[PDB]
Each structure stands twice: as structure tokens, then as C-alpha cells.
Amino acid sequence: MKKIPCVMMRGGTSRGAFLLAEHLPEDQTQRDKILMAIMGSGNDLEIDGIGGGNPLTSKVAIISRSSDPRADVDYLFAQVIVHEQRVDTTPNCGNMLSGVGAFAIENGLIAATSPVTRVRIRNVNTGTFIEADVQTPNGVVEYEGSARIDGVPGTAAPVALTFLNAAGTKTGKVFPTDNQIDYFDDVPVTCIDMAMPVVIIPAEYLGKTGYELPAELDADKALLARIESIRLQAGKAMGLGDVSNMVIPKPVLISPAQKGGAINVRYFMPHSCHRALAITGAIAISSSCALEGTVTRQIVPSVGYGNINIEHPSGALDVHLSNEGQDATTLRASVIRTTRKIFSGEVYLP
Amino acid sequence: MKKIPCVMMRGGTSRGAFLLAEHLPEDQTQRDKILMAIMGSGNDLEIDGIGGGNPLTSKVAIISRSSDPRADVDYLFAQVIVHEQRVDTTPNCGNMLSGVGAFAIENGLIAATSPVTRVRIRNVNTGTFIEADVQTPNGVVEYEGSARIDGVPGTAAPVALTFLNAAGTKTGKVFPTDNQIDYFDDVPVTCIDMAMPVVIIPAEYLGKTGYELPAELDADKALLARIESIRLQAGKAMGLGDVSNMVIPKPVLISPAQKGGAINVRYFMPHSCHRALAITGAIAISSSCALEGTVTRQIVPSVGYGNINIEHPSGALDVHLSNEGQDATTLRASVIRTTRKIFSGEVYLP
């Protein structure tokens, strides 16, 4: 293959290639080689591709009509490594998800309504179903707007992303250990599975304020050891086992908010500190703020339901919670993002 | 309670009250008493209520915002018995389902789009999820149209009903016996669980043409005995047991179509012959026409995917099938119905 139709979009705080699955081979090895060639994997600047030389700008979304009768379109995410020729398809990138709905409408994968078009998205990586609400005045995708998000200059049209089956994405229970609060190494933590299995740890119980820079937290090797002792222990307790080379659970250091939000967090990828915050992690953290009996209730003031602002090293993120039922299994989370179509045309492969 | 807001609607070939769950008590006994008083249960003509004295015109739909994050509205169906004061909430009435989406839009349970509004419906009776596509030009529900269905004079606006999780509604497998064809009493049958657990039996193997009137089939007590022998045997084989007092599986006698359709059926409920055909039964039968290896392939010509016309004692019903996957678990079925709002106001209780 020497050329392929391609669309570059900014999805939230990320950017990358949006492709139709029609235009890719079924063989996983050949498909991954094409993705590396599109983004320019293997060079620090990705000088020979369309990638920006940074993980945030070296992503791929593969879109198609859904194989599942409950969804409209299928969404497969791929992380194209920058420094080396590798492809990773493990996580669900919530920011690239912001572009899926608009891309599906512009490419005729679903009929548009007015003034908004609902798009049912199934993330192939995780099996998670997300509804996207796209601004479509007169049936035409609108990118201009007055919505604003951290990390992106200016304003764009808002896209609403509502997670439909976040409860027990990897376990099947909101609290896999059957306890709202557990104890590991004399540290009160909370094990919760909402869009992402995480173990919530108060930063102060590990001798940290929780406001340190991600680089400073990565340098404290004694802290990273104390975090791993809890992560390995929490994973086994959450119905998993020997998570030593799995990327779950995600340890999250929490502390009170400093800029008026509900909570401040430090998200670990497992082993390094996230420079911002994963959307799935934001779902899990905001959920613990609303559910009764979690360790979060001992750290930050009660929030109830509504807008829950999560602070992270590089800004803040609003998560809207809602629950029409009684159990935590019906807790519904939504996030506002923005997206923009940047480049539409043909990408050529070396 | 002496009065309650109420809306009478025709849903497909049925008619009854559409109520908001807000206006009913939580106690099941008091709620059922109110439903009987609305319909006039206990009189052959339902002379003291709004019911028509016939099961088709003595139904209730209780609508509310969904407790499930995957749906927009919840739909609870109730059958109000005519000749005695009883309420039955077992089945999922697909015809009354035709009115749920338009009722939810008119009562502000979901915002309207244009020219169509998608409504995600969860049937509380069965846990089945259905999408309704309502004609809403300029955001206003439209009941006028050119669509036509058997049993209802004139034409009205079409409403599309797409079943989202019909596979294994009671079992969890499309073929609970792990066989496309089973044998009971030397009769080749097919056990399938699609929107409804049914056992598909060729009419000719029981000495019947399959075109007899429902009354003639009910009079043949020797036939009803042979059908029960296969039903009790099929229920135990499909992972159930002693279905002697259960209403599932529903046995279906099949024979070739006579008026140009794909197949002719006699739907047993499970003892008496249905005068028409249940929508859920239509999903199951049409599915067996498309799935390879079923006993239906030995009775009627192949149909493939698309429009599958099912003939029944009082007309025919079109089922649209579709599958973007490989397995029978991703088989998607949709049906066109019509609905109309008849009476909006207040109902008074004796």
C-alpha cells in the first residue's frame, strides 16, 4: 500500500489520523505497519509522517459501522509510538473519542438530525459504549462554538460524551473487593471499577501533598515503591492477580482541590505520573466522590451529583454525574469536549 | 385515588392507556387496582372504564425516564384482563411499544430532533432494549403519514422499532440446546431464543396443513397434546425445566406462505392459538429463516437478509433483518408500526 484516504482531527487535547476500517488490511501486522507509516513512527519529531512527535499528536482512530446491534459505529483506538516503530491498542482514548461522532456523520456512517445528532459508539478496545452528541444544525456538522477546554486555545463547538456501561468494565462490580474502603500497608484506599479499575490512595498517607509535579513524583523512587506495593495488593484483591506487568489497576493519589474544584489527583499509568488525566480515570474518581463510604469522603468535602471538577497536573476537567436508580451500577457520567477537522485528503506511505 | 392524567393511544393493532409512572403508587396492589379501574376490568364490555372489552383494547403502558443509563425511557406493560379483575405484567407488547416514543416526546421525557427523533426504550417486563424512530418534522411528533399495517384502517406515520438485545432474552444463547435442529417425538424442530424462546415445529409433521383457523386448531385436542409433549421436552432441553406452568417456550407451527410472504405461522401462547402473531414471535421466526441449519430451511425457500414477510391467521407482518457481524448474536431485527394519539386528559376512578 502506497496511499490511503485519511482525515486529521483534533480530538479534545489529542490529535491524530481518523481512518475508515475499509481502507486497512485485516492482517494485524500489515495494518500496524501502515499506521506507523502514516504517523511517521520511529523518529523523535515524526519527520516523515503526519504525527507531531508527541504521544498526544501520534494517535489513530479506526472507524466503521458497528458490528454490535446496540451501537451505530465501532471505534478502535491505536497509539503509534514515537521513538520506536510500535503500535499499542490497549487503552480507550477519550479525547480522540471526541472526533468519532463528527467523523462518522461526515463520512455517511449515520444519518444526521437537527440541531443535534446522537451517535452510539462502541469502543472496540474495551467494549465500552459511549453516546456522542454532535452539534448538527440543519444536519451539518458544526465545529465552531463557544465551548472551552484546558490545553486547547480558543473556543469550539461542544461535543457531549456519555459513558453508558462504565460500571465494572474489567471486573463486573463497581467495588470488586466488596468493600468501599480497603486497607493495604496501613493506608486506607478505595478499589473501584468505573470505566477504569483504579485504586484511590490519599496522597498525604504516603508522605506527599499531592500537588507535586509529575516529574518530581517520578523521581521519588521510594514513593513509587510504596505505590506498587499497594497496586499489586489491590489488583489481587479486586479479582485480578499478579498485575506486575498489567496496566491495571491505575493508582491515583488524591488530595483536596486548590483552584475551587472538587478534588486534585495524580494519575499513574501504572508506573509514571500522567501529565494530565485520563477521561476514564476521571469517571472513576468523580464516581467515588458521589458514592457513599469511599475513602474520597474522608479527603474532600461532599459533592453530591452534578458537575464534579477534577484537578490534575495540567488543568481541570468537568465530569457530570447522574443517577436515576438506587445502585452504583446505574451511575451515569458525561464529559464535554471539543473537536475540529484539520486535514482531509490522501496520505502517502514511504 | 379518584382521578389520574391519562392518554389513550392506538399502538399498532392495540389500544390502551399511556401513563406516567409519577402518577401511580409504588405499591403493586394499589397500582393494579387503579389500572383495573381505568380500563373497567370485570365487565365483558368494560362498560365502566375506557377499555374496549377486548384484550387488544385493554392494555396499559407505564412510561418514565429510564433507571438504566443505556436507555432514555422505561416502558412497563400491563395486560388488564376483561372478564375478571386481574392484571398481567408478563409479556412485552410490541404493538403498545409503538406509542412509547411519541408519548415520551410529547410529555418532555426526551428532547426532539428533526426530522426524526431516536428514543432508546427499555422494556421493564423483559429487560429488552428497543430503539424507536419517531417522525418529528421540526421537532413535533407527526402521526399523519402513508404507512399501512394490517388490522388498522387508513394510513399513518411509520414508527420504526429496532430490537437491540433479542439474542438469548431468557437463556443467553440463540440456540440453548446447542443445536440448530433438535428431535422430539420423531419430529424435527428448532429451539431458538430471539426476543422470545420458541420451538419451531413444521405443521405437516403433526398432521396439519398449518392454514387452519385458530379456533379449529384449539378444538383438535389430540394436536394440542402432541404440541405439549414437544414443548415440555423442548423447555427442559433449552436449559429450563418443568415449563408445565410457564408460558415459555412458545410453540410455533410453520408452513410455507400462501400470499407471497416468506412463511406462514400458527403462534401458540403456549396452549391456545394466537389470532395474529406476537412481535417477539415474529423476531424469532424471521431469525430462523435467516440463520443456517434451522428446520425452517427444510420448509420454506431461503430468504437471506432484508424484508421477511411472516404470514399469520389475520394478516402478515414485515420484519427487516440485518447483521454486520458473523455470529447470530449480532442479528438485528426491526419492524414498522404506526401509532396515533386518541384521547388526552383526565380519567376518573369509581
CA B250 to chain centre: 12
Q: Nine-digit cell at A144? A: 465552531
Q: In this complex, do B115 and A113 lie within 8 Å of one another by their Cβ atoms?
A: yes
Torsional sign, CA B230, B233, B235, B238: negative
SS3 B141: coil
Q: In this complex, do B164 and A115 lie within 8 Å of one another by their Cβ atoms?
A: no
Q: In this complex, do A330 and B114 lie within 8 Å of one another by their Cβ atoms?
A: no
Q: Which of B70, B114, B165 sits opposite A113 (nearest CB)?
A: B114
Q: Which of A64, A68, A332 to mutate to test the interface with B (most CBs of B within 10 A)?
A: A68
Chain B residues with CB within 8 Å of chain A CB: 65-70, 113-118, 129, 162-165, 324-325, 330-332
What angle (nearest 5°) sits at the alpha carbon of residue B196, between those of residues B193 and B199? 65
Q: Which chain B residues are Cβ-neighbours of A325 within 8 angstroms? A: 67-68
Beta carbons of A94 and A75 less than 8 angstroms apart: no
Say how many C-beta atoms besides its own lie within 10 A of residue B325's C-beta.
13
**What gap in Å lies between CA B147 and CA B168, rounded to an integer?**
31
Q: What is the tally of helices (H) and strands (E) in chain A? A: 5, 16
> Measured between CA atoms, how close is B285 to chain A, in angstroms?
18
Beta carbons of B43 and B50 less than 8 angstroms apart: no
Q: In this complex, do A330 and B117 lie within 8 Å of one another by their Cβ atoms?
A: no
Location of C-alpha cell 473519542: A97
User: Closest Cα partner for A190 from A304, A328, A280, A294?
Assistant: A294
> Measured between CA atoms, how close is A78 to chain B, in angstroms?
22
Task: Tell me the CA end-to-end span of chain A in Å, nearest whole number.
Answer: 9
Chain A residues with CB within 8 Å of chain B CB: 65-70, 111, 113-118, 129, 162-165, 322, 324-325, 330-332
Element (H, E) at A30: helix A28-39
Q: Which residues contact B188 (CB under 8 A, 6 or more apart)?
A: B181, B182, B202, B205, B295, B298
- What radius of gyration do chain A's Cα atoms show? 20
- Structural resolution in Å: 2.4
Element (H, E) at B59: strand B59-65
Residue of A nearest to B113 (CA): A114
**What gap in Å lies between CA B189 and CA B186, rounded to an integer?**
9
**What gap in Å lies between CA A272 and CA A190, rounded to an integer?**
20
Q: Which residues contact B304 (CB under 8 A, 6 or more apart)?
A: B290
Residue of A nearest to B135 (CA): A113
ω into residue B249 within 30 of 0, thus cis? yes
Domain positions in chain A are: 1-165+334-350, 166-333
Distances (CA, A) of B42 to B1, B37, B38, B46: 19, 9, 11, 7
Catalogue the E-assigned strands of chain A.
3-11, 14-20, 59-65, 73-80, 87-88, 116-123, 128-135, 158-163, 182-184, 187-193, 197-202, 250-255, 263-267, 306-312, 315-322, 332-348
Q: Which residues contact B222 (CB under 8 A, 6 or more apart)?
A: none
β-strand A116-123 against A128-135: which pairing, if any?
antiparallel
Q: Which of B138, B140, B324 to mutate to test the interface with A (most CBs of A within 10 A)?
A: B324
In eight-state DSSP terms, residue A284 is H
Q: Which residues contact A175 (CB under 8 A, 6 or more apart)?
A: A191, A192, A193, A328
**What gap in Å lies between CA B41 and CA B34, rounded to an integer?**
10
Q: In this complex, do A324 and B165 lie within 8 Å of one another by their Cβ atoms?
A: no
Q: Which chain B residues are Cβ-neighbours of A165 within 8 angstroms? A: 69-70
Q: Which chain A residues are Cβ-neighbours of B115 within 8 angstroms? A: 113-114
Distances (CA, A) of A10 to A79, A96, A288, A340, B157: 15, 7, 30, 5, 41
- Tell me the count of A-B CB pairs closer than 8 A: 54
Classified by CATH at the fold level, domain B1-165+334-350 comes out as Diaminopimelate Epimerase; Chain A, domain 1 (3.10.310)
Residue-wise DSSP of B183-230: EETTEEEEEEEBSSEEEEEEGGGGT--S-S-HHHHHH-HHHHHHHHHH
Query: Reduced to 3 DSSP states, what percent helix, strand and coil does chain B have, rounded to the nearest 5?
Result: 25, 35, 45
Say how many C-beta atoms besides its own lie within 10 A of residue A280's C-beta.
26
> Measured between CA atoms, how close is B68 to chain A, in angstroms?
6
Q: Which of A65, A70, A330 sits opposite B69 (nearest CB)?
A: A330
> Measured between CA atoms, how close is A36 to chain B, in angstroms?
28
Beta carbons of B275 and B217 less than 8 angstroms apart: no
